[PDB]
Amino acid sequence: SSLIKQIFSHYVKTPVTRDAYKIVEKCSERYFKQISSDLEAYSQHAGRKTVEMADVELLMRRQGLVTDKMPLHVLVERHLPLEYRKLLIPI
């Protein structure tokens, strides 16, 4: 949607064609399909039907985003708005 455009432009910091945006949308649909299968694997492997915080953290560690130098709470502080940080990191 429009949102994906706002975010992508915000990060890319230069002008982007209409078609390029359309690609970003397609690739975003792909992203969600792929992680959905990974999250299912994590849940099924832990013998349960829910996605837990630790699962998505493990996702992000496997993606090279969470690391020893860069723990999750730092990504949360850096990238999400106050109202979400409040829910994720109330202490």
Binding site: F8, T14, T17, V24, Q34, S36, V51, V56, E57, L75
Partner: protein, 73 residues
């Protein structure tokens, strides 16, 4: 700002019997944002490699291939 409902629905679209615990949709959204960030940096680099002042489909497509590969779980 972000449509949490939409997130839940997207995930459901792919795996209807997956349950998200209460605030996990927020970490999912974060991972997506970081995905788009990585995509933007790779694509910009593609553009820059072509001396294209604008981001083109082919920049984003080559970048997508690289970044989805990094996004595996």
């Amino acid at each position: 700002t972000v449509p949490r409902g939409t997130l839940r629905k997207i995930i459901k679209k792919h795996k209807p019997h997956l349950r998200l615990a209460a605030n996990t949709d927020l970490l999912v959204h974060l991972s997506f944002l970081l995905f788009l960030h990585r995509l933007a940096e790779e694509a910009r680099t593609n553009a820059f490699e072509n001396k294209s002042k604008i981001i083109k489909p082919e920049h984003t497509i080559a970048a997508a291939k690289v970044i989805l590969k990094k996004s595996r779980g």
